[PDB]
Write an enzyme that holds these catalytic residues in place. Structure first.
Site, PDB file in Angstrom:
ATOM      1  N   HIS A 137      -6.266   4.612   9.108  1.00  0.00           N
ATOM      2  CA  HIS A 137      -6.061   4.307   7.808  1.00  0.00           C
ATOM      3  C   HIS A 137      -5.363   5.390   6.815  1.00  0.00           C
ATOM      4  CB  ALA A 189       2.149  -0.069   4.625  1.00  0.00           C
ATOM      5  CB  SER A 220      -0.955   0.168   1.081  1.00  0.00           C
ATOM      6  OG  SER A 220      -1.897  -1.011   1.078  1.00  0.00           O
ATOM      7  CE1 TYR A 270      -7.588  -5.864   4.259  1.00  0.00           C
ATOM      8  CE2 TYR A 270      -5.329  -6.281   5.099  1.00  0.00           C
ATOM      9  CZ  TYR A 270      -6.296  -5.866   4.077  1.00  0.00           C
ATOM     10  OH  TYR A 270      -5.608  -4.712   3.420  1.00  0.00           O
ATOM     11  CD  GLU A 271      -8.266  -7.371   0.176  1.00  0.00           C
ATOM     12  OE1 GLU A 271      -7.292  -7.980  -0.310  1.00  0.00           O
ATOM     13  OE2 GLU A 271      -8.517  -6.325  -0.405  1.00  0.00           O
ATOM     14  N   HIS A 306     -10.014   1.260  -5.905  1.00  0.00           N
ATOM     15  CA  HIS A 306      -8.682   1.193  -6.677  1.00  0.00           C
ATOM     16  C   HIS A 306      -8.262  -0.434  -6.898  1.00  0.00           C
ATOM     17  CG  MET A 350      -2.580  -6.739   8.954  1.00  0.00           C
ATOM     18  SD  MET A 350      -4.202  -5.578   8.738  1.00  0.00           S
ATOM     19  CE  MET A 350      -4.242  -4.533  10.399  1.00  0.00           C
ATOM     20  CB  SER A 351       0.584  -8.365   3.256  1.00  0.00           C
ATOM     21  OG  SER A 351       1.691  -7.436   3.661  1.00  0.00           O
ATOM     22  CG  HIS A 383      -4.167  -7.628   2.276  1.00  0.00           C
ATOM     23  ND1 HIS A 383      -4.375  -7.009   0.984  1.00  0.00           N
ATOM     24  CD2 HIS A 383      -2.898  -6.770   2.706  1.00  0.00           C
ATOM     25  CE1 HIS A 383      -3.721  -6.049   0.776  1.00  0.00           C
ATOM     26  NE2 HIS A 383      -2.588  -6.031   1.719  1.00  0.00           N
ATOM     27  CG  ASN A 395       1.213   2.739  12.163  1.00  0.00           C
ATOM     28  OD1 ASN A 395       1.343   2.242  10.956  1.00  0.00           O
ATOM     29  ND2 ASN A 395       0.965   2.072  13.018  1.00  0.00           N
TER      30      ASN A 395
HETATM   31  O1  JSI Z   1       0.026  -0.799  13.173  1.00  0.00           O
HETATM   32  C1  JSI Z   1      -0.069  -1.503  12.081  1.00  0.00           C
HETATM   33  N1  JSI Z   1      -0.405  -2.809  12.883  1.00  0.00           N
HETATM   34  C2  JSI Z   1      -0.908  -3.742  11.762  1.00  0.00           C
HETATM   35  N2  JSI Z   1      -0.936  -3.697  10.669  1.00  0.00           N
HETATM   36  C3  JSI Z   1      -0.499  -2.663  10.176  1.00  0.00           C
HETATM   37  C4  JSI Z   1      -0.337  -1.881   8.820  1.00  0.00           C
HETATM   38  S1  JSI Z   1      -0.597  -3.037   7.414  1.00  0.00           S
HETATM   39  C5  JSI Z   1      -1.609  -1.801   6.516  1.00  0.00           C
HETATM   40  C6  JSI Z   1      -2.806  -0.933   7.212  1.00  0.00           C
HETATM   41  C7  JSI Z   1      -3.218   0.074   6.526  1.00  0.00           C
HETATM   42  C8  JSI Z   1      -3.367   0.272   5.250  1.00  0.00           C
HETATM   43 BR1  JSI Z   1      -4.431   1.633   4.345  1.00  0.00          BR
HETATM   44  C9  JSI Z   1      -2.363  -0.579   4.261  1.00  0.00           C
HETATM   45  C10 JSI Z   1      -1.701  -1.795   5.288  1.00  0.00           C
HETATM   46  C11 JSI Z   1      -0.680  -2.406   4.532  1.00  0.00           C
HETATM   47  C12 JSI Z   1      -1.122  -3.085   3.263  1.00  0.00           C
HETATM   48  P1  JSI Z   1       0.111  -3.867   2.546  1.00  0.00           P
HETATM   49  O2  JSI Z   1      -0.143  -4.652   1.228  1.00  0.00           O
HETATM   50  O3  JSI Z   1       1.338  -2.935   2.147  1.00  0.00           O
HETATM   51  O4  JSI Z   1       0.892  -5.158   3.349  1.00  0.00           O
HETATM   52  C13 JSI Z   1      -0.081  -0.795   8.879  1.00  0.00           C
HETATM   53  N3  JSI Z   1       0.130  -0.345  10.137  1.00  0.00           N
HETATM   54  C14 JSI Z   1      -0.079  -1.301  11.036  1.00  0.00           C
END
Ligand code: JSI
EC number: 2.4.2.1
Length: 282
Positions: free
Chosen positions: A254, A113, A30, A85-86, A61, A216-217, A83, A240
């Site tokens: 988010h 991320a 992401s 979670y989807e 998207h 989560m990936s 993912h 974060n």
């Molecule tokens: O603090 C956290 N705890 C647990 N998980 C996370 C993620 S993971 C994520 C969160 C929000 C969005 Br919008 C996108 C993604 C990634 C998606 P990816 O395909 O890059 O893995 C980011 N921060 C944290």
């Protein structure tokens, strides 16, 4: 699941529809989607057009394979990744990684991320993945669950060596090569299923288990890549800092993840483009 011949059919179809023969597969996390813009002789396929290929649930998207050249490497990029979670079972999440293998890909670059658990980490940092903790895998959510096909790999593959030693060195090098104000982090990624963010108690659990970042990936794709014999390198954009104390009055969101994604865009695209030169030719 899928039969061996579902993957073969998808691979051959893609070979029949592009002259591109990719060596490196890149899965954009992401906020690294822009990276498809850096490709040359870019040929786009929407997931929906590819036989057997899971279609995206995010109508806002959607998801594309882009075949093309990045810095004189023959690439296939996934823009938009699946993912758990989807609601995708892990044999759908990791379906692309087996297609890449049969296209003749020998290297996988995975980006994501992730939330910082290591207190030394700051928003905007890149952490190279030295290792992972597969919490879903312990419980039975492992993408190799079911019959094993010897044409892909062994029943019981090792993951102790999952993140290529060589590519991690060549990555630290490349980072020095460009200088850069903040240092390149290295550490353990813990996969949790999500989609909700962690409690303080949960954050403390993940710290105690020895994780530097949580997302989560990535981990299922890595397992299936390694089961095939693909070389694997990846990293996390730290979007974060995970609230680790009840005194704090900040919360994960988010928007702050997307925003960090937009900020560290160029830096990550730049970094991944230069790294192509560091990937051995076949
Ligand atoms: O603090 C956290 N705890 C647990 N998980 C996370 C993620 S993971 C994520 C969160 C929000 C969005 Br919008 C996108 C993604 C990634 C998606 P990816 O395909 O890059 O893995 C980011 N921060 C944290």
């Amino acid at each position: 699941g899928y039969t061996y011949e579902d993957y073969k059919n998808t691979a051959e179809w893609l070979l029949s529809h592009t002259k591109h023969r990719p060596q490196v597969a890149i899965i954009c996390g992401s906020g690294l989607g822009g990276l498809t813009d850096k490709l040359t002789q870019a040929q786009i396929f929407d997931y929906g057009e590819i036989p057997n290929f899971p279609r995206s649930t995010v109508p806002g998207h959607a998801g594309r394979l882009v075949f093309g050249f990045l810095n004189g490497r023959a690439c296939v990029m996934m823009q938009g990744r699946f993912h758990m979670y989807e609601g995708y079972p892990l044999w759908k999440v990791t379906f692309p990684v087996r297609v890449f293998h049969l296209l003749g890909v020998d290297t996988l670059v995975v980006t994501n991320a992730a939330g910082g658990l290591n207190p030394k980490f700051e928003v905007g940092d890149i952490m190279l993945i030295r290792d992972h903790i597969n919490l879903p895998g312990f419980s039975g959510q492992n993408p190799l669950r079911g019959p094993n096909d010897e044409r892909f790999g062994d029943r019981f593959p090792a993951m102790s060596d999952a993140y290529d030693r060589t590519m991690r060195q060549r990555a630290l090098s490349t980072w020095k090569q460009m200088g850069e104000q903040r240092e390149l982090q290295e550490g353990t990624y813990v996969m949790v299923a999500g989609p909700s963010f962690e409690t303080v108690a949960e954050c403390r659990v993940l710290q105690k288990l020895g994780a530097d970042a949580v997302g989560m990936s990535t981990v299922p794709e890595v397992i299936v890549a390694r089961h095939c014999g693909l070389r694997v390198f990846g990293f996390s954009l730290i979007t974060n800092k995970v609230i680790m104390d009840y005194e704090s009055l900040e919360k994960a969101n988010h928007e702050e993840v997307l925003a960090a994604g937009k900020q560290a865009a160029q830096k990550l695209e730049q970094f991944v483009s230069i790294l192509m030169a560091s990937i051995p030719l076949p």
